[PDB]
Amino acid sequence: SKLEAILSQEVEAEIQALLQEAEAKAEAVKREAEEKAKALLQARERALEAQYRAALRRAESA
């Protein structure tokens, strides 16, 4: 039947829209997780090198 095929089309269209929305969501999720992890790694070179340099400052002064 026509509406046999049309309800099959509706199920396929809702599944395809569902998975496209899920693709956009998963891409934004891996984007935000990678941005947070790289903000971590960018902050850690500051948080470690500043400690190392201040240690050499006070060691040289001592």
Binding site: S1, K2, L3, I6
Partner: protein, 50 residues
């Protein structure tokens, strides 16, 4: 006479027939919600009752 509205709807759709029990012919028409409600209004304009 009632299937003119079904042909006015989607023709290869809308399973619409009368099986048996000739005291009153059980004209059942099944398509959808909204378009079937519009076609049911058109059939009641042609003369029909749920």
């Amino acid at each position: 006479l009632v299937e003119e509205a079904l042909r006015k709807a989607l023709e290869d759709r809308y399973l619409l027939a009368h099986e048996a029990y000739a005291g009153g012919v059980a004209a059942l028409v099944v398509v959808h919600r909204k378009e079937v409600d519009q076609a049911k209004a058109a059939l009641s304009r042609a003369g029909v009752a749920e």
